[PDB]
Design a binder for this molecule. Structure first.
Ligand SMILES: CC(=O)SCCNC(=O)CCNC(=O)[C@H](O)C(C)(C)COP(=O)(O)OP(=O)(O)OC[C@H]1O[C@@H](n2cnc3c(N)ncnc32)[C@H](O)[C@@H]1OP(=O)(O)O
Ligand SMILES: CC(=O)SCCNC(=O)CCNC(=O)[C@H](O)C(C)(C)COP(=O)(O)OP(=O)(O)OC[C@H]1O[C@@H](n2cnc3c(N)ncnc32)[C@H](O)[C@@H]1OP(=O)(O)O
Ligand SMILES: CC(=O)SCCNC(=O)CCNC(=O)[C@H](O)C(C)(C)COP(=O)(O)OP(=O)(O)OC[C@H]1O[C@@H](n2cnc3c(N)ncnc32)[C@H](O)[C@@H]1OP(=O)(O)O
Ligand SMILES: Cc1cn([C@H]2C[C@H](O)[C@@H](COP(=O)(O)OP(=O)(O)O)O2)c(=O)[nH]c1=O
Ligand SMILES: Cc1cn([C@H]2C[C@H](O)[C@@H](COP(=O)(O)OP(=O)(O)O)O2)c(=O)[nH]c1=O
Ligand SMILES: Cc1cn([C@H]2C[C@H](O)[C@@H](COP(=O)(O)OP(=O)(O)O)O2)c(=O)[nH]c1=O
Ligand code: NA
Ligand code: NA
Lengths: 209, 209, 209
């Protein structure tokens, strides 16, 4: 397999370098724009430079290890024009991937995650540690599912949706593009575009756009 | 082992056909009363007919893959008179079954579930994906534990109890027959028969009967 | 390896005898002060006597299998003077221990627990079943993390902190010494010393000292 460039040397990039290693991949390094991170390492893996150096590594697979759905979309749209780069799909050896699971390029399925049956993910999704996506779940592009999220059957998550840590989503709930579910929320109603909901039961906090 | 008939071709039957396959079982097919499902398949496995065709398959093990505790009880009482049929016990290879675990016929323990020590389950129980039953937990017959439920030590769950996804139950809590705990509930008090409780902390919503 | 003495023959000691067995350890027995437990067993393992018999077993490793952080501290300070005894570190074969994980003596990591990267634990910590400690998490001494707790990145847990079952802690939150987070709490603010917080979102209930 090609060596991997990880975009993002923060908390998510730290954990995705670990995922890559567990997947048997060689990480060439990170690209990160943070001034303080130039010349730095995570566990023997160098920050090689800024995102505008990505054209130096067309021989590598990429993943965008940045938790914010919008930040991944923005990076793809600016730095990764269609067909110029290839993207890894990283599935932790301890993740459970069942039957009729469809996962598009750039997606990261972390340790202990469970996707049961008939689950569809778009490009550059994240399913973090110990999260569960039950039967018939659909994710759009650039969806972030945080650790321990509980995504019940037939839930639909639009593009650039974020589901916070240990939140719970009732079966058949639809979450429209750009919405965010706070950590620990108990979601029993559909959510409209760009809405942030929090609490038990989940209620509208604010709109993100 | 005998081939398996799965009663219920909905969301739970979909996931239990997957469980059966993972357990090395051959699923002969589903029985389901849904008109729209006659002549249909889940992933190469046929809906063979209606529940009143169950006497055609006495050479098979059965499981009742229907999430509603009352629906499983009703099906057993009408269609499965004592000693006429045999029932599978399905334990996912990725479920953790510890020591002095007692599980009665027809029970389904799904992927990533954990039963630690001194746990007792009655007949036709479901412990769904990533749920944890800690030391001394007792389930009656026809108990449903949804994905990611957190059932602390020495909790007692009566017959036809349902514990919703990612709910949490305080140690030593008793839940009397027929009660339901909403998804995400934080249960710190005993629950009486047929009560539905929701929220954090869990409070009485309504009575189911 | 040395045979193990487990201090505490209650619910936690029951589960830690199971952990020890899974770790390939031989448990010589329990020490427990409970009058009713003298001459009793858990699953072929005897209660040998009271804690003041610990000097009879300097040839054994010890673990303090008592959930209360303060009870472990009190037992260590009274019965286990510095350098007189050795302590086991027990990590369930189904726990995931990632890279640059530092765990001090007497710590118990239970079945399905996940510590990702750059996690530091002090002495006599407990990480119970299916809990997740994400990148950069730091635990002091005598920290209890209950089943299914969701401890996000860069969270700091002081000494004698207790995090209740299936609680969720927002990234970068600091919890000062002696605080307790109720089961199912959604913690989005720092917590001060000896504070008990409950609920969604977590709010001050009382002070423990
Ligand atoms: C490995 C990893 O670490 S992956 C990362 C895992 N982390 C997550 O999933 C955390 C996701 N983040 C959240 O849930 C945040 O709490 C957010 C984004 C919803 C809101 O954060 P902020 O915009 O900083 O909101 P803030 O904390 O200032 O709170 C504003 C109000 O909303 C409430 N609130 C905010 N978040 C939540 C929540 N998750 N649940 C309940 N109430 C909440 C607050 O109580 C406050 O109410 P008030 O006006 O009555 O005081
Ligand atoms: C693989 C799988 O998918 S397995 C399936 C996993 N799914 C589950 O576990 C979900 C279990 N279902 C639930 O928890 C449901 O929310 C139920 C059954 C408790 C209630 O559903 P309904 O009867 O449809 O109640 P409904 O949604 O109309 O809400 C009624 C009231 O209760 C409240 N409420 C309902 N459920 C909950 C909940 N889980 N938590 C908090 N509040 C709740 C609502 O906010 C509403 O309050 P209001 O009167 O102030 O508006
Ligand atoms: C394998 C295993 O079993 S490991 C063990 C796992 N167990 C745990 O993690 C449980 C931890 N314990 C808790 O969370 C407890 O609920 C505690 C310690 C916070 C409080 O317990 P107590 O001191 O007995 O408080 P009590 O139950 O009397 O409730 C007092 C008030 O706080 C509220 N409250 C208490 N705990 C909680 C909670 N976790 N969430 C929300 N509200 C709570 C009650 O609703 C009550 O409010 P009121 O005054 O409005 O009636
Ligand atoms: C949005 C964005 C972020 N970054 C980097 C800056 C930070 O080091 C990193 C984000 O790290 P951090 O803020 O910890 O968040 P995350 O959980 O997504 O890792 O991403 C870029 O290099 N370019 C970008 O366009
Ligand atoms: C109660 C009941 C249900 N069913 C079928 C109808 C539906 O296809 C199926 C239930 O599917 P569904 O409604 O998705 O719920 P579950 O989560 O339990 O699968 O069970 C019967 O065939 N007979 C019965 O007596
Ligand atoms: C605090 C303390 C407890 N114990 C014992 C008494 C009980 O049997 C046991 C605690 O069991 P229990 O009360 O079930 O709680 P836990 O979850 O910690 O097991 O610890 C001692 O023997 N000495 C002590 O100093
Ligand atoms: Na798990
Ligand atoms: Na959870």
């Amino acid at each position: 397999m090609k060596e991997l460039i990880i975009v993002g040397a923060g908390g998510h990039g730290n954990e995705i370098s670990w995922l890559a290693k567990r997947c048997g991949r060689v990480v060439r390094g990170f690209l990160d724009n943070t001034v303080e991170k130039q010349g730095t390492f995570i566990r023997d893996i160098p920050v090689l430079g800024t995102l505008d150096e990505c054209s130096k590594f067309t021989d590598c697979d990429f993943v965008i290890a940045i938790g914010s759905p919008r930040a991944r979309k923005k990076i793809i749209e600016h730095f990764f024009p269609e067909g110029e780069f290839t993207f890894a799909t990283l599935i932790d050896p301890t993740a459970t991937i069942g039957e009729n699971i469809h996962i598009e390029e750039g997606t990261m399925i972390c340790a202990g995650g469970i996707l049961t049956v008939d689950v569809k993910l778009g490009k550059h999704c994240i399913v973090n540690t110990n999260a569960v996506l039950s039967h018939g779940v659909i994710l759009g592009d650039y969806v972030t599912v945080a650790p321990n999220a509980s995504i019940s059957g037939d839930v639909s998550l639009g593009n650039i949706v974020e589901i916070g840590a240990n939140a719970t989503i009732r079966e058949k709930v639809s979450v429209q593009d750009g919405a965010m579910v706070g950590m620990g929320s108990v979601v029993i109603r559909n959510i409209l575009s760009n809405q942030v909901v929090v609490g038990n039961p989940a209620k509208l906090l604010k709109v993100i756009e």
